[PDB]
Amino acid sequence: PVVKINAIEVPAGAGPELEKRFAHRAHAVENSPGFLGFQLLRPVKGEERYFVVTHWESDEAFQAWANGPAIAAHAGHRANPVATGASLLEFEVVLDVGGT
Amino acid sequence: PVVKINAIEVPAGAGPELEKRFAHRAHAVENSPGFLGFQLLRPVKGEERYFVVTHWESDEAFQAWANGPAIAAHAGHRANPVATGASLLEFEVVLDVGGTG
Ligand code: HEM
Ligand code: HEM
Ligand SMILES: [C-]#N
Numbered sequence: 001p002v003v004k005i006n007a008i009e010v011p012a013g014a015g016p017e018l019e020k021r022f023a024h025r026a027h028a029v030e031n032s033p034g035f036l037g038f039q040l041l042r043p044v045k046g047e048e049r050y051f052v053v054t055h056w057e058s059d060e061a062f063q064a065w066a067n068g069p070a071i072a073a074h075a076g077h078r079a080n081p082v083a084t085g086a087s088l089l090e091f092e093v094v095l096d097v098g099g100t
Numbered sequence: 101p102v103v104k105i106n107a108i109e110v111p112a113g114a115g116p117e118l119e120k121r122f123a124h125r126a127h128a129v130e131n132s133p134g135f136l137g138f139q140l141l142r143p144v145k146g147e148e149r150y151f152v153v154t155h156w157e158s159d160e161a162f163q164a165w166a167n168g169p170a171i172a173a174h175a176g177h178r179a180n181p182v183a184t185g186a187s188l189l190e191f192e193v194v195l196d197v198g199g200t201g
């Protein structure tokens with residue numbers, strides 16, 4: 001599996017609004033082939049960006065989503081997005097261990 | 101829940117050895133109170149650091165682990181650690197949503 005993190009930059013104090021929008025649009029990625037889920041992570045220390053941690057069965061499944069479905073998923077709402085920037089951080093899962 | 105990511109810097113070519121050592125000690129933190137699990141993430145694009153993504157029921161549970169058990173968990177092995185640096189990135193989980201798979 002792979003992990004693709006969108007690290008989002010938002011103005012100071014814009015956090016609550018960003019979170020609000022994600023919550024409202026939490027289910028935009030439903031039904032996507034190869035999608036394993038995502039977390040929205042609020043920064044507390046060591047980072048100032050929100051991490052949108054998305055999980056996929058393969059890089060192929062992610063690239064398929066990015067090439068259309070993601071664009072549709074981000075369309076159709078309130079103008080003026082909150083983010084001032086974003087960086088895509090891409091990983092392969094080496095280990096995945098549960099807490100026993 | 102909270103997420104604590106240890107972002108590890110390793111020399112070129114040091115990847116496999118780091119991964120090896122994590123695999124060997126993967127189950128040292130397994131029964132820690134409040135520990136929900138972890139992933140070791142190998143960078144492919146946009147980052148050069150390994151991300152060690154650890155999940156905890158609370159900041160309190162993580163802090164208890166760090167103040168002793170974590171030190172114990174990292175002790176007693178190869179006299180030459182691989183990493184050249186590390187930064188702890190700390191988050192609160194706002195949303196956690198499942199998928200198709
Ligand atoms: C994993 C790869 C992803 C990429 C590369 C990506 C891309 C982006 C980018 C560039 C932005 C800033 C510009 C904009 O707001 O349109 C953004 C914001 C946003 N994205 Fe994503 N996204 C990803 C995942 C997700 C997922 C999984 C969701 C929701 C389930 C999501 C929902 C949102 C929302 C709600 C915003 C803020 C929109 C606003 O401020 O009005 N994104 N995304
Ligand atoms: C937020 C959680 C964690 C923090 C702050 C942390 C701290 C550190 C630091 C500072 C290093 C670099 C110095 C060293 O090699 O000892 C390191 C490396 C390492 N950590 Fe962690 N750690 C965390 C989670 C974990 C977990 C969950 C595991 C295993 C299940 C783990 C296993 C290892 C291993 C195998 C190394 C490399 C040791 C070597 O190269 O010889 N760490 N950790
Ligand atoms: C979505 N970021």
Ligand SMILES: [C-]#N
Pocket residue numbers: 106108152
């Ligand atoms: C462990 N980092």
